[PDB]
Amino acid sequence: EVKGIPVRVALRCRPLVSKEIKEGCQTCLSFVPGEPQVVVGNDKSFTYDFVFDPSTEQEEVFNTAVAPLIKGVFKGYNATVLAYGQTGSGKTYSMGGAYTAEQEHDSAIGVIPRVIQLLFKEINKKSDFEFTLKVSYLEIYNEEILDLLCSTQINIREDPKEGIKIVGLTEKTVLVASDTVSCLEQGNNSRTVASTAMNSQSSRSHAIFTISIEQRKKNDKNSSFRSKLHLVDLAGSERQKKTKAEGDRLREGININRGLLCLGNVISALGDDKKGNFVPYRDSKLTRLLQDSLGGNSHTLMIACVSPADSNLEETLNTLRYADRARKIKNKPIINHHHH
Ligand SMILES: Nc1ncnc2c1ncn2[C@@H]1O[C@H](COP(=O)(O)OP(=O)(O)NP(=O)(O)O)[C@@H](O)[C@H]1O
């Protein structure tokens, strides 16, 4: 029995990568055809809302798991898609967190460029309605919020009558798909990325791409829906013994791991939520920004990314365990009406 509106979880297993083939890894994950199950270490089974094996292409991930969620923003809901998993697991790949214009029309494009396409397709169908879209794009780098659309210090202020405000963050008002994707491209070029042994293009920050959507009926300008879509490419857990990181790179890894610890503590707290519980959102900027997304006013999809390689079994088990806990989180999305 599942009561209410849980966080949904898609488990995505990428294929083996060159590093793993080089080191002689075997696959340690197996799948059960047509069932949303994965078997790990040929022994332990986990069930999710979706399971995508290594052959699953970007288009299928999007159409199966993401598109139905995005369509909910047109009913006036907030929604979040967040990718979570070890370094090198495929979060940025899945999300399109490194998309550039060079990738336009490549079937390898990920979630964010696909969301932008879909939003404008749906807007064009909804000829009886008018829309306002704005985008912001930030990263959380070594515990600071940096504006990725900014080629002063940004701070979180809690409004008493509902919600976080990110003071000093810029927004662009967009008109069509092309200028919306330009924002993604621009922010992606600013995202802090560096090499480690586990990923030559490791994300050194958590990135959040936000589209604010206002919808109103053309025959009635006073009433609207106003909601937000957050598209989140987290940084991933890493171990110095595998990354070989030193200096500033290792400091990034420490800050990343600490934040992900805070996220794990939030997920664990929410799994058994009840009256009088405490959930440690306040412990990190990341978990403050994800407060509505996890346990609050949002429809939320986690894309949990894993490597199939036996050398990563421990990390993969950690991701599977936390992704299993995330399914127990109950959200309370409402229709975000506004009247003027
Ligand atoms: N499903 C997939 N199919 C094929 N290649 C993949 C897939 N997922 C990831 N890759 C490749 O694996 C490498 C690492 O992916 P990436 O998405 O950068 O990892 P990440 O999870 O974002 N790591 P990090 O930012 O360090 O926490 C890249 O070269 C990707 O193109």
Ligand SMILES: [Mg+2]
């Ligand atoms: Mg990444």
